[PDB]
Enzyme design. Structure first.
Site, PDB file in Angstrom:
ATOM      1  N   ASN A   1       0.857  -1.185   0.000  1.00 37.21           N
ATOM      2  CA  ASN A   1       0.000   0.000   0.000  1.00 37.21           C
ATOM      3  C   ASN A   1       0.895   1.236   0.000  1.00 37.21           C
ATOM      4  O   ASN A   1       1.072   1.924   1.008  1.00 37.21           O
ATOM      5  CB  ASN A   1      -0.948  -0.021   1.194  1.00 37.21           C
ATOM      6  CG  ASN A   1      -1.791   1.237   1.294  1.00 37.21           C
ATOM      7  OD1 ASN A   1      -2.736   1.426   0.528  1.00 37.21           O
ATOM      8  ND2 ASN A   1      -1.456   2.100   2.246  1.00 37.21           N
TER       9      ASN A   1
ATOM     10  N   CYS B   1      -4.912   4.245  -5.622  1.00 37.45           N
ATOM     11  CA  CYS B   1      -6.319   3.916  -5.871  1.00 37.45           C
ATOM     12  C   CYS B   1      -6.403   2.542  -6.523  1.00 37.45           C
ATOM     13  O   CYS B   1      -5.999   1.550  -5.893  1.00 37.45           O
ATOM     14  CB  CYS B   1      -6.947   5.061  -6.669  1.00 37.45           C
ATOM     15  SG  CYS B   1      -6.903   6.670  -5.846  1.00 37.45           S
TER      16      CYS B   1
ATOM     17  N   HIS C   1     -11.123   2.450  -0.108  1.00 36.43           N
ATOM     18  CA  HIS C   1     -10.432   1.180   0.068  1.00 36.43           C
ATOM     19  C   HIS C   1     -10.687   0.317  -1.161  1.00 36.43           C
ATOM     20  O   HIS C   1     -11.844   0.057  -1.512  1.00 36.43           O
ATOM     21  CB  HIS C   1     -10.907   0.476   1.339  1.00 36.43           C
ATOM     22  CG  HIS C   1     -10.208  -0.819   1.615  1.00 36.43           C
ATOM     23  ND1 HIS C   1     -10.847  -1.904   2.177  1.00 36.43           N
ATOM     24  CD2 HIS C   1      -8.924  -1.202   1.415  1.00 36.43           C
ATOM     25  CE1 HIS C   1      -9.990  -2.901   2.306  1.00 36.43           C
ATOM     26  NE2 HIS C   1      -8.816  -2.500   1.852  1.00 36.43           N
TER      27      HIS C   1
ATOM     28  N   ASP D   1      -5.999  -7.774  -1.127  1.00 34.77           N
ATOM     29  CA  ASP D   1      -6.177  -6.503  -0.430  1.00 34.77           C
ATOM     30  C   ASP D   1      -4.801  -5.890  -0.188  1.00 34.77           C
ATOM     31  O   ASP D   1      -4.341  -5.790   0.952  1.00 34.77           O
ATOM     32  CB  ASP D   1      -6.947  -6.709   0.885  1.00 34.77           C
ATOM     33  CG  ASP D   1      -7.343  -5.401   1.544  1.00 34.77           C
ATOM     34  OD1 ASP D   1      -6.782  -4.348   1.173  1.00 34.77           O
ATOM     35  OD2 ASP D   1      -8.214  -5.428   2.439  1.00 34.77           O
TER      36      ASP D   1
HETATM   37  O1  LIG Z   1     -11.538   4.517  -8.078  1.00 35.68           O
HETATM   38  C1  LIG Z   1     -12.276   5.294  -8.578  1.00 35.68           C
HETATM   39  C2  LIG Z   1     -12.766   6.487  -7.758  1.00 35.68           C
HETATM   40  C3  LIG Z   1     -13.545   6.040  -6.517  1.00 35.68           C
HETATM   41  C4  LIG Z   1     -14.633   5.007  -6.841  1.00 35.68           C
HETATM   42  C5  LIG Z   1     -14.305   3.665  -6.955  1.00 35.68           C
HETATM   43  C6  LIG Z   1     -15.285   2.729  -7.249  1.00 35.68           C
HETATM   44  C7  LIG Z   1     -16.599   3.134  -7.425  1.00 35.68           C
HETATM   45  C8  LIG Z   1     -16.931   4.475  -7.310  1.00 35.68           C
HETATM   46  C9  LIG Z   1     -15.950   5.412  -7.018  1.00 35.68           C
HETATM   47  N1  LIG Z   1     -12.702   5.074  -9.954  1.00 35.68           N
HETATM   48  C10 LIG Z   1     -12.247   3.906 -10.787  1.00 35.68           C
HETATM   49  C11 LIG Z   1     -13.429   3.133 -11.366  1.00 35.68           C
HETATM   50  C12 LIG Z   1     -14.296   4.030 -12.185  1.00 35.68           C
HETATM   51  O2  LIG Z   1     -13.495   4.540 -13.288  1.00 35.68           O
HETATM   52  C13 LIG Z   1     -15.493   3.249 -12.736  1.00 35.68           C
HETATM   53  N2  LIG Z   1     -16.078   3.988 -13.848  1.00 35.68           N
HETATM   54  C14 LIG Z   1     -15.570   3.834 -15.071  1.00 35.68           C
HETATM   55  N3  LIG Z   1     -16.053   4.482 -16.127  1.00 35.68           N
HETATM   56  C15 LIG Z   1     -17.109   5.339 -15.978  1.00 35.68           C
HETATM   57  C16 LIG Z   1     -17.634   6.038 -17.108  1.00 35.68           C
HETATM   58  C17 LIG Z   1     -18.707   6.908 -16.949  1.00 35.68           C
HETATM   59 CL1  LIG Z   1     -19.360   7.778 -18.364  1.00 35.68          CL
HETATM   60  C18 LIG Z   1     -19.273   7.099 -15.686  1.00 35.68           C
HETATM   61  C19 LIG Z   1     -18.760   6.417 -14.584  1.00 35.68           C
HETATM   62  C20 LIG Z   1     -17.659   5.525 -14.744  1.00 35.68           C
HETATM   63  C21 LIG Z   1     -17.103   4.806 -13.648  1.00 35.68           C
HETATM   64  O3  LIG Z   1     -17.556   4.945 -12.565  1.00 35.68           O
HETATM   65  C22 LIG Z   1     -14.786   5.177 -11.389  1.00 35.68           C
HETATM   66  C23 LIG Z   1     -13.638   5.957 -10.749  1.00 35.68           C
END
Ligand SMILES: O=C(CCc1ccccc1)N1CCC(O)(Cn2cnc3cc(Cl)ccc3c2=O)CC1
Ligand SMILES: O=C(CCc1ccccc1)N1CCC(O)(Cn2cnc3cc(Cl)ccc3c2=O)CC1
Lengths: 335, 334
Positions: free
Chosen positions: B11, B16, B257, B274
């Site tokens: 970690n 992320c 997490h 993890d």
């Molecule tokens: O780690 C993060 C930020 C925190 C997070 C993690 C997991 C779920 C919600 C928020 N992310 C990676 C996974 C993701 O990239 C998933 N993802 C991928 N593509 C998308 C495209 C559109 Cl158009 C809208 C939402 C997402 C999306 O949530 C969102 C940000």
């Protein structure tokens, strides 16, 4: 801040933002300072007027005027700016600077900084014939509707168009032939100018409308996957440098530009004569939209960041240019 | 349960989803083998992503301790929590795979990335009141599926290929004609051997204020048939997929997490990665317990593998797959 703002001398709209963006392109400013304008006319010379503006921004402690600059290239009415997009104004300034640099060492400096290489191709499917059309580009207009961010805009930008119906490709001798139309990036300029297509039409009301859809842009932009050939040691990783924003969804709105001139993450807000420190949130996240949002973005290639943003000192201004400008003040300082 | 034979990633900080993605690609054995073969002798250790990836994969395969990723993050460029939060997981995978694919050019492994992850789709946009119609072909290495109001992955795919009306604004920019009301349709020409599915749980709440995470319940199966979503179905190779991994996120927003569940062998024996802690788990914890509360720990990305390509994609990897010069170089750095 240490930086001086620009006067608001009329309805110049996005001009003040553009000038600040170009002024902090240190490699471009140095090139403008080296332009041989000794014989140029004070009233009609855009390169000389551009030198005067950059010079005053670097030495003056008070807001700098732009009347003679606009008067040099003929945009003296609000309309003049309503006719053209921001990139077309940047073209008039860069092309005036580049022509004056002809027959010198600094020649081709503007193309090196801003120009990129791409190819528009039409490939037939049933027959073997390909038409490649090479074209230089100094800016990229990104489609934002339905696109989450710059990454998604570039994916759509390289999408392959199909020509197979009544819209078959007229291959001349080959007549009508099913084909594919697309664009391929060959190179990316050290300074990347990106415009967001927020001005729309709108046939029902027959007017141009600004769409305030949310469009995200990162501080670090990787574009290697979109190049036709990648160059190790020179990755296509870009760093955000400026964020031009507008409010009101109309030419009569408010124009401001955000900049971290040193590319060090320290951002400043340029609002005409007022220059104030600001956070990364105010310059980036607060301009994603979703009526104040960004319409143009400036990225600088990370490998070229030291050269593009090299420090410019008084030693980089020719004495002939200084003597002339200071001579100008004595006439006007006669007050 | 605490001794699985697999090693985890330290970690380091706010990388992320990086560690979750890396474990994903590491257990894409056919990809791992191709990464070992890349000619990286002339690469710069400080700026080479391919070499850094080889280093991480090598350590995950031989190390007895959590593996670090500082060299990879340093060479990649993203070294801040703010940087990763500005990019989705699919862009990280695209930049990494594209960088490794360029390195494989002119080798016996050239084109491994496109063969494993690249699929093709065709879409059209037809204006209702104007004689303007645009047809397009496109390559995709990942799929964003909508979950809001969608019960399961089946409904999400149905919504993906459903004809969506472009009315409101919303309105399609039909060049000379647009803005124009139009209908958009998309369809799948092919599906790749390894299917990366991102679930759109991170959406912008408009005032509201900022982006909000969607913890709604969304169900995904262990076996995913996608044949009816293709334009042409052919026997002897139906579009049947097997869930290979489930990337999950707990917490919310900037601070979160990250964990990834994987059955590396494709045999249904799941494990929980993890960061430095890897432990065996049940199928239910990897699948059902990630559907979303009714909470905080749910899946945001799935990795399916075509059943016909399972044995090939998950082929066994041995030390003999690592060229000696690569081994000697990494042993020198240590
Ligand atoms: O780690 C993060 C930020 C925190 C997070 C993690 C997991 C779920 C919600 C928020 N992310 C990676 C996974 C993701 O990239 C998933 N993802 C991928 N593509 C998308 C495209 C559109 Cl158009 C809208 C939402 C997402 C999306 O949530 C969102 C940000
Ligand atoms: O200041 C204005 C007028 C008001 C305005 C400001 C900001 C955003 C929308 C409208 N503009 C300068 C910036 C821009 O020139 C941005 N821009 C540039 N090129 C485009 C090309 C196409 Cl094909 C479609 C839209 C744009 C566009 O909006 C739009 C007009």
């Amino acid at each position: 801040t240490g930086y001086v703002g620009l006067k608001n001398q009329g309805a110049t709209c996005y001009m003040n933002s553009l000038l600040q963006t170009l002024f902090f392109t240190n490699q471009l400013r140095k090139a403008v300072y080296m332009m041989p304008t000794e014989g140029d006319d004070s009233s009609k010379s855009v390169p000389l007027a551009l030198q005067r503006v950059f010079y005053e921004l670097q030495h003056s402690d008070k807001p700098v005027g732009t009347k003679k600059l606009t008067k040099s290239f003929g945009w003296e009415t609000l309309d003049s700016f309503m006719q053209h997009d921001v990139q077309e104004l940047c073209r008039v300034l860069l092309d005036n600077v580049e022509n004056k640099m002809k027959g010198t060492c600094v020649e081709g400096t503007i193309p090196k900084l801003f120009r990129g290489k791409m190819v528009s191709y039409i490939q037939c499917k049933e027959v073997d014939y390909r038409s490649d059309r090479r074209e230089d580009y100094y800016d990229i207009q990104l489609s934002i509707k339905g696109k989450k961010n710059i990454f998604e805009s570039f994916v759509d930008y390289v999408a392959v168009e199909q020509l197979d119906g009544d819209n078959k490709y007229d291959a001349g001798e080959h007549g009508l032939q099913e084909a594919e139309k697309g664009v391929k990036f060959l190179t990316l300029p050290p300074v990347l100018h990106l415009q967001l297509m927020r001005f729309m039409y709108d046939p029902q009301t027959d007017q141009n409308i600004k769409i305030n859809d949310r469009f995200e842009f990162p501080e670090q932009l990787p574009l290697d996957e979109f190049l036709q050939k990648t160059d190790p040691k020179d990755p296509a990783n870009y760093i955000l440098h400026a964020v031009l924003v507008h409010s009101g969804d109309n030419h009569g709105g408010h124009y401001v530009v955000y900049l971290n001139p040193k590319g060090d993450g320290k951002w400043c807000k340029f609002d005409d004569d007022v220059v104030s420190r600001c956070t990364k949130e105010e310059a980036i996240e607060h301009n994603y939209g979703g009526c104040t949002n960004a319409y143009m973005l400036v990225y600088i290639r990370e490998s070229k960041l030291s050269e593009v943003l090299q420090a410019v000192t008084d030693h980089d201004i020719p004495q002939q240019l200084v003597e002339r400008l200071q001579e100008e003040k004595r006439i006007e300082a006669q007050k």
